[PDB]
Amino acid sequence: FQRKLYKELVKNYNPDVIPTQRDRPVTVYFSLSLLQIMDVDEKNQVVDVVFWLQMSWTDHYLQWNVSEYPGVKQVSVPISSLWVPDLAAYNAISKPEVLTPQLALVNSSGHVQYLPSIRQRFSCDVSGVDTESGATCKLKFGSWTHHSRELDLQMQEADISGYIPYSRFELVGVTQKRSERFYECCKEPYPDVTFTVTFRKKG
Amino acid sequence: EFQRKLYKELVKNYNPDVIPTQRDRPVTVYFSLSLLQIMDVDEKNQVVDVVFWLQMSWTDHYLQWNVSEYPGVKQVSVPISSLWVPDLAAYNAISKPEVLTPQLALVNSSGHVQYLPSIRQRFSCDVSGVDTESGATCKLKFGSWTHHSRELDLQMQEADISGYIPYSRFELVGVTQKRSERFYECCKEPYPDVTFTVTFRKKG
Amino acid sequence: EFQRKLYKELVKNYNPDVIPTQRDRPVTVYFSLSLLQIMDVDEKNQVVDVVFWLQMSWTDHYLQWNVSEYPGVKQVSVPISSLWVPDLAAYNAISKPEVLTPQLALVNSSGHVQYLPSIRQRFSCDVSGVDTESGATCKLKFGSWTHHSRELDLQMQEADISGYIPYSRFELVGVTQKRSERFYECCKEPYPDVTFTVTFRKKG
Amino acid sequence: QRKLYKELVKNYNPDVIPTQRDRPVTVYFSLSLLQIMDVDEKNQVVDVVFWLQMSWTDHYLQWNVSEYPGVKQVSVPISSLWVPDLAAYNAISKPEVLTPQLALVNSSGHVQYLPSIRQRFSCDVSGVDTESGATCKLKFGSWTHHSRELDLQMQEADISGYIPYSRFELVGVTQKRSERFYECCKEPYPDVTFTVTFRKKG
Amino acid sequence: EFQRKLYKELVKNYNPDVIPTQRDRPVTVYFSLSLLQIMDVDEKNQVVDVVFWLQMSWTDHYLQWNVSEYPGVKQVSVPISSLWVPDLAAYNAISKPEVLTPQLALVNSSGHVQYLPSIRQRFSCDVSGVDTESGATCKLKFGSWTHHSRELDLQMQEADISGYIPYSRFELVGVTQKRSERFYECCKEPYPDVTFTVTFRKKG
Numbered sequence A: 001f002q003r004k005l006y007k008e009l010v011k012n013y014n015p016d017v018i019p020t021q022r023d024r025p026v027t028v029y030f031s032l033s034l035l036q037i038m039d040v041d042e043k044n045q046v047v048d049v050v051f052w053l054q055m056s057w058t059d060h061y062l063q064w065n066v067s068e069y070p071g072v073k074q075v076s077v078p079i080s081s082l083w084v085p086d087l088a089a090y091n092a093i094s095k096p097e098v099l100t101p102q103l104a105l106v107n108s109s110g111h112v113q114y115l116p117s118i119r120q121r122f123s124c125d126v127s128g129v130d131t132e133s134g135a136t137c138k139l140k141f142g143s144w145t146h147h148s149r150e151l152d153l154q155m156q157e158a159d160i161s162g163y164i165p166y167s168r169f170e171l172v173g174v175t176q177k178r179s180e181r182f183y184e185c186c187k188e189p190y191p192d193v194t195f196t197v198t199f200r201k202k203g
Numbered sequence B, C, E: 001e002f003q004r005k006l007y008k009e010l011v012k013n014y015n016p017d018v019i020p021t022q023r024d025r026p027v028t029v030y031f032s033l034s035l036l037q038i039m040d041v042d043e044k045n046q047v048v049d050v051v052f053w054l055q056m057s058w059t060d061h062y063l064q065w066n067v068s069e070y071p072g073v074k075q076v077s078v079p080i081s082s083l084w085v086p087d088l089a090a091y092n093a094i095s096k097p098e099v100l101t102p103q104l105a106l107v108n109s110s111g112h113v114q115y116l117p118s119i120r121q122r123f124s125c126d127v128s129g130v131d132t133e134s135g136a137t138c139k140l141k142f143g144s145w146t147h148h149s150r151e152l153d154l155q156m157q158e159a160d161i162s163g164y165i166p167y168s169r170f171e172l173v174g175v176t177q178k179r180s181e182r183f184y185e186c187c188k189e190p191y192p193d194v195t196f197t198v199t200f201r202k203k204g
Numbered sequence D: 001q002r003k004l005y006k007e008l009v010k011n012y013n014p015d016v017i018p019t020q021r022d023r024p025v026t027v028y029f030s031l032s033l034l035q036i037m038d039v040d041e042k043n044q045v046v047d048v049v050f051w052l053q054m055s056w057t058d059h060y061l062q063w064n065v066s067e068y069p070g071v072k073q074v075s076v077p078i079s080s081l082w083v084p085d086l087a088a089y090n091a092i093s094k095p096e097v098l099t100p101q102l103a104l105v106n107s108s109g110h111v112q113y114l115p116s117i118r119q120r121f122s123c124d125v126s127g128v129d130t131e132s133g134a135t136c137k138l139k140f141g142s143w144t145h146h147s148r149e150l151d152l153q154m155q156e157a158d159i160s161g162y163i164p165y166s167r168f169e170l171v172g173v174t175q176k177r178s179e180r181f182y183e184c185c186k187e188p189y190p191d192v193t194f195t196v197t198f199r200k201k202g
């Protein structure tokens, strides 16, 4: 008993299908928690970054009658088992290295939360990393195949308290804003949240 | 959704190992390379590390549907492992290709597939004059690995250069893209290949 | 002893994605870290390369059997991909964990699972005073990643230090291990965590 | 018109070497040297990039050209059929295959597999700076199938693929197949060995 | 040949996760290491990069057949993923093992299996005196990870040293191989292990 819910939640479920529903796009809440700026290649213009990626959305195919399943309040599912935002780091110059277990938490109302810790390298102008002005990196994320009307990317207060106390670099400033733009190819507009970080070398 | 019984259909009698050529008609795939950055240049070993968007599109007749039978379904985002994809290859690459974006293609209700993966790969290139005013010239040659002219028709299309990183140790002196058809030792037929030629020099 | 129709049974109605709880009964997993070596210390980027032996054990009620019905079968060696395993995570790790040993767990006839993977992983750590007599102190924090206190109860147990390599550029000034319960920004609940604190200094 | 794939993979086990009574499967092997990436003089290794040209005949893979109209050949994933389990006896790194792992199959069952590969080999690169140059022996051969199961035959090695620029110039190249017995393994195992002699330009 | 309806049979009621033991009869596996090369030595981190042939053989009673019912079939080349294989582990390795050859073992008509992987792996080792005449001594310890003495009996056998590379920055001062049995902190039973000890020094 108890987890005959997994048998159910994955019965007629195709993880390749964005769980939208007539007119209304699936809205995914995105937020980036900067944890550390590992390195800066001044010669090739890249930053090695470690961060928490906070994503949540609602999959209507994934809800259940809390009755029929007694104590089951939430379930920990493998992201390979359900649909997940196909977010992409636009300016990344390296495959993303996901450091935590690829599990997602699912609510009895179908609310999903996937919170992977990641290390990835981005293309960035790290010129003034030694000036008082510092260097500014723009970490741009957004769905890769779903446009505004299919997947609505919404941001939400970026956390900065995870930032490592020691660390060769100090955070001069941080901002996060979502945008919508058209691309050479692809007819529709694409929403994207961009985490902008300004940092300088301590001392 | 509610109407994605379309995926169940699109993959029913579908073998992704089968090039969708419809009799006496080679599948024509449109190819274009958007140079984003020239990461490094190994002058000692003659290689360039390059990052680029790869724009490919073609038509899979097995993948079309009656827009009626499936109400609001205009297009679908499918895993490239689920359908046939051009077996393009970097003839002069000296490293496996590292695909940076989600491996998904967009499929039209008329069977038009689009696949734009961002890739980082190293190529064999004579980077001698990367410091001269002439600059170094790298030829990134791509082409279908096992399908010849009559099976897969590689067509190019205006290469985009606006994606190029503004900062970056290197500046783009020149860029050209042209498709060709050749004969190779072995393989009876001729194979088409689009070659992106880039000339760049170190700024300052 | 042949009669391994037990594996057929142990994996019949078994979903490894399901944490083996039982109403108001969290699965308690015993965790312990045996430090084997401190490979390197990046003073520039603040990281430590560490090789350790994680000792984990817990009870999966779905995995017990009547020792009668299966004669000589005392225990079984199963692939961790075949059963539920604590989704422990290195909270301060800056690299994917590289597991060096076969990913097999041992299972008791009473459902007691043992899993002791040897691992090499890099952690974020202030390795400033690695040359001072005080030494540097690294905190290796582990904890479930998706299950809170009431679902998975992380319990520690005497950390072993005898595995530490005799030679090695570094000597162990001190070691402590303690479990805690904290709340995080997001996730409404408490997630227990055992933290292995190591203080080491460069020999000579 | 590809119900041929459905057929070609029906009662087909890619783990079974396509032999017949007292008839070893003969695979034609040839290496096209494309580039000598690097040379570690301290550890004695060469980084090499090359085209491997393999062909053989799989009798399970032929069809009546009639029953399948225009189908002259098919491009199949090597995971779908049997492929020589060749190994680089002296490689010190896993092989990195750079091209799509697809093979071409004839209507008569003739298979062709041409994978571009980058791999590192153990080699005495001492005299890479002398006029004599360094000589590397790239030895390949079936890993589990002996002479009577898999007959490795060589064939004129191509050298025109060699990169014009490149820190190194090709002083000499030879390719020869051999048969030997090893410590263990009762039977003799054949192997084609590509020997390259190169020196640093200038 | 062919008559490979033998593979269909050999894998019918076969679970590769089941050690082919049998009531008071541990499966005995013969292990031997052929040192081919000592790639590098990190004196700062105390590690050795090594390339070796691991020679393993054992008997799987589930894998035998009536040589009659299958005419010319003397032996078969099977993928190790298809049958049970000793879960040997390099107790003191600090890197995942990189297997360089095709992962196939050969199987006798009497059930005798032979796996012969070539491997490159890094081990924790005190490479202090690699420049002294005494040389450095590395102990490569292997052993089953989850099966104790009574389940899997590890037996050694004359280590081969003729595979050692003639050139190479290092020369072999000495080589010895011996199996042992111990009891460990945890795990009730005793576990057997073969340890390849190599002493080498820098040439010249």
Ligand SMILES: *[C@@H]1O[C@H](CO)[C@@H](O)[C@H](O)[C@H]1NC(C)=O
Binding pocket: A065, A067, A068
């Ligand atoms: C489903 O929920 C309804 C109310 O929302 C409840 O009346 C019903 O009993 C539930 N299903 C069952 C029978 O478990």
Ligand SMILES: *[C@@H]1O[C@H](CO)[C@@H](O)[C@H](O)[C@H]1NC(C)=O
Binding pocket: A073, A107, A108, A109, A111
């Ligand atoms: C479900 O998730 C949503 C997310 O906002 C939350 O509001 C709600 O309280 C959660 N509880 C359940 C079980 O629905």
Ligand SMILES: *[C@@H]1O[C@H](CO)[C@@H](O)[C@H](O)[C@H]1NC(C)=O
Binding pocket: B066, B068, B069
């Ligand atoms: C499309 O589907 C409709 C179903 O009502 C029908 O007219 C017919 O089967 C199809 N015709 C096309 C291809 O437009």
Ligand SMILES: *[C@@H]1O[C@H](CO)[C@@H](O)[C@H](O)[C@H]1NC(C)=O
Binding pocket: C066, C068, C069
């Ligand atoms: C255990 O299983 C056996 C069947 O082999 C059954 O007869 C017995 O009642 C069960 N309980 C005991 C006695 O352990």
Ligand SMILES: *[C@@H]1O[C@H](CO)[C@@H](O)[C@H](O)[C@H]1NC(C)=O
Binding pocket: C108, C109, C110, C112
């Ligand atoms: C396994 O069962 C034994 C009795 O057979 C019990 O005492 C022990 O606590 C259990 N767990 C282990 C393997 O320690």
Ligand SMILES: *[C@@H]1O[C@H](CO)[C@@H](O)[C@H](O)[C@H]1NC(C)=O
Binding pocket: D064, D066, D067
């Ligand atoms: C080939 O096929 C034709 C008709 O499909 C048949 O009549 C003929 O006997 C076949 N020949 C072969 C290859 O045996």
Ligand SMILES: *[C@@H]1O[C@H](CO)[C@@H](O)[C@H](O)[C@H]1NC(C)=O
Binding pocket: E066, E068, E069
């Ligand atoms: C093994 O082979 C013999 C061959 O005559 C056959 O009778 C039977 O399958 C096996 N032996 C017996 C008599 O059980």
Ligand SMILES: *[C@@H]1O[C@H](CO)[C@@H](O)[C@H](O)[C@H]1NC(C)=O
Binding pocket: E108, E109, E110, E111, E112, E114
């Ligand atoms: C096959 O049988 C022989 C005896 O004929 C025996 O030594 C061993 O089990 C097998 N030989 C091999 C492959 O070592």
Ligand SMILES: Clc1ccc([C@H]2C[C@@H]3CC[C@H]2N3)cn1
Binding pocket: A143, A144, A145, A183, A185, A186, A190, B104, B105, B106, B114, B115, B116, B117
């Ligand atoms: Cl298959 C495919 C089609 C289009 C795209 C483009 C749409 C968004 C914005 C740029 C890139 N991601 C990416 N992939």
Ligand SMILES: Clc1ccc([C@H]2C[C@@H]3CC[C@H]2N3)cn1
Binding pocket: A103, A104, A105, A113, A114, A115, A116, C144, C145, C146, C184, C187, C191
């Ligand atoms: Cl899917 C998901 C939900 C919540 C979490 C959070 C809970 C624990 C503490 C921080 C992180 N791990 C991580 N992942």
Ligand SMILES: Clc1ccc([C@H]2C[C@@H]3CC[C@H]2N3)cn1
Binding pocket: B144, B145, B146, B147, B184, B187, B191, D102, D103, D104, D112, D113, D114, D115
């Ligand atoms: Cl299996 C196979 C057969 C032939 C080929 C050839 C087709 C393209 C052009 C030369 C080479 N690559 C590639 N692969």
Ligand SMILES: Clc1ccc([C@H]2C[C@@H]3CC[C@H]2N3)cn1
Binding pocket: D142, D143, D144, D182, D185, D189, E104, E105, E106, E114, E115, E116, E117
């Ligand atoms: Cl499973 C197995 C058994 C034997 C062998 C050996 C036979 C040929 C020659 C050396 C190596 N390849 C390799 N693998």
Ligand SMILES: Clc1ccc([C@H]2C[C@@H]3CC[C@H]2N3)cn1
Binding pocket: C104, C105, C106, C114, C115, C116, C117, E144, E145, E146, E184, E187, E191
């Ligand atoms: Cl699941 C499990 C049980 C026991 C062990 C230990 C027993 C042998 C000796 C150390 C390690 N291998 C490792 N894993």
